[PDB]
């Protein structure tokens, strides 16, 4: 009526069968969980830079 309680005997070998995978990194990480006060302004800064660098072919000439 009594059986075994717990074990870790075969668990390491099962883990390495298909390798232990490290997720691949990217160039641009996500902005989830950064300071919202920073995030509100950073949106406007990228917007203004987009308006320029386009009129750079129609004037301005930075």
């Amino acid at each position: 009526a009594k059986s075994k309680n717990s074990s870790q005997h075969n668990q390491s070998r099962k883990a390495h069968r298909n390798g232990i995978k490290k997720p691949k990194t990217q160039r641009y990480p996500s902005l989830k969980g950064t300071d919202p006060k920073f995030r509100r302004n950073h949106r406007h800064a990228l917007h203004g830079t987009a308006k320029a660098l386009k009129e750079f072919k129609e004037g301005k000439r930075e």
């Binding site: 668990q11 883990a15 298909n18 232990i20 995978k21 490290k22 997720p23 969980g33 950064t34």
Partner: peptide, 15 residues
Amino acid sequence: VGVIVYKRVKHRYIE
């Protein structure tokens, strides 16, 4: 500050 670490949980890594 916020920090990013990778933790091993059996057969994978989690961020």
